[PDB]
């Protein structure tokens, strides 16, 4: 329903989030995925590292500069998982992929924007308790991505600023809640109560 | 693309192409190279189209020369027009 949906990547399963986002894009919807480094995969860490190394074996033998390109950043791992779910070699598939933006951390302007979750791809609601899982940032750092500490630093800073913002907003909603409760017994308030409001 | 996955590339090219395409088309329409509307007095819908006749009447009304009227055809049109004028003369 929104013009652009900014999906918080944290706690989501790579394949299930990728499928959801791909069908969203093919339907004309603009999706942004932020915090791609806290995205999740099912299975123990070593198993997914082994699957990535299996991907990382593939390379054009005679000229490795034209083989599969193994992009290491968690945004690009998610993007690869998503590009396989779209006919990206067509103009329709290319057009749909260009309704997608994926980032590590939360850069501007999306830090001031509402983040959503996709429950059918959330690890909490999907993956049975006790089953091992892999956080994508660990996997990317393990297989080459060299900006985990940077994103962690900037995310700590962003969390500090956002905590200040939320403290202010909670103070203001305390004031507004007091005001609406002080008017909660007037004639017009009771009339709105009769109408489910 | 694979180096700039966050920039639209196909969509930007298509927007640029539609912009340049109808800018060129409007440039052609303002210079009048396109044919006029069917209801226009300058249109030829329902009437025969002839390069030779158009050039003959453009030279009589008094350039483009890829469209050329031969002196052979010019004499033939003059003769045919003399016949037609004699026909209108016997009409009136």
């Amino acid at each position: 329903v929104e013009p652009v949906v900014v999906i918080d990547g944290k706690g989501h399963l790579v394949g299930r989030l990728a499928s959801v986002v791909a069908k969203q894009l093919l339907n004309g919807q603009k999706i942004v995925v932020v915090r791609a480094e806290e995205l999740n995969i099912s299975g123990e860490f070593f198993r997914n590292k082994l699957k990535y190394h299996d991907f990382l074996r593939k390379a054009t033998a005679f000229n490795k500069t034209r083989g599969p390109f193994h992009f290491r950043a968690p945004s690009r791992i998610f993007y690869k998982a998503l590009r396989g779910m779209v006919s990206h070699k067509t103009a329709r598939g290319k057009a749909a992929l260009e309704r997608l933006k994926v980032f590590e951390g939360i850069p501007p302007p999306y830090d001031k924007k509402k983040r959503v979750v996709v429950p059918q791809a959330l690890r909490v609601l999907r993956l049975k308790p006790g089953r091992k899982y892999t956080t994508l940032g660990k996997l990317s750092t393990s297989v080459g991505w060299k900006y985990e500490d940077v994103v962690a630093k900037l995310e700590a800073k962003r969390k500090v600023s956002s905590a200040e913002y939320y403290a202010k907003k909670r103070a203001f909603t305390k004031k507004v809640a007091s005001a609406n409760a002080t008017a909660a017994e007037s004639d017009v308030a009771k009339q709105l109560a009769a109408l489910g409001y | 693309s694979k180096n700039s996955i966050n920039r639209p590339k196909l969509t930007s090219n298509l927007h640029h192409k539609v912009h340049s395409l109808n800018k060129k088309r409007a440039q052609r329409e303002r210079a009048g190279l396109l044919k006029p509307a069917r209801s226009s007095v300058n249109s030829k819908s329902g009437e025969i189209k002839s390069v030779a006749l158009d050039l003959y009447f453009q030279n009589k009304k008094n350039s483009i020369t890829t469209r050329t009227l031969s002196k052979k055809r010019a004499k033939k049109i003059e003769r045919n027009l003399k016949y037609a004028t004699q026909r209108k003369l016997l009409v009136d």
Binding site: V4, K101, P107, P108, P109 | R7, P8, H15, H16
Partner: peptide, 27 residues
């Protein structure tokens, strides 16, 4: 900003990217 030179430079760059649909960060 930094100065009027950089301000006009950045505003023009961002408007060109928004007007050609070539933005990494926005749409």
């Amino acid at each position: 900003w930094r100065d009027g030179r950089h301000h006009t430079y950045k505003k023009a760059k961002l408007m060109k990217q928004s007007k050609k649909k070539t933005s990494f960060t926005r749409f």
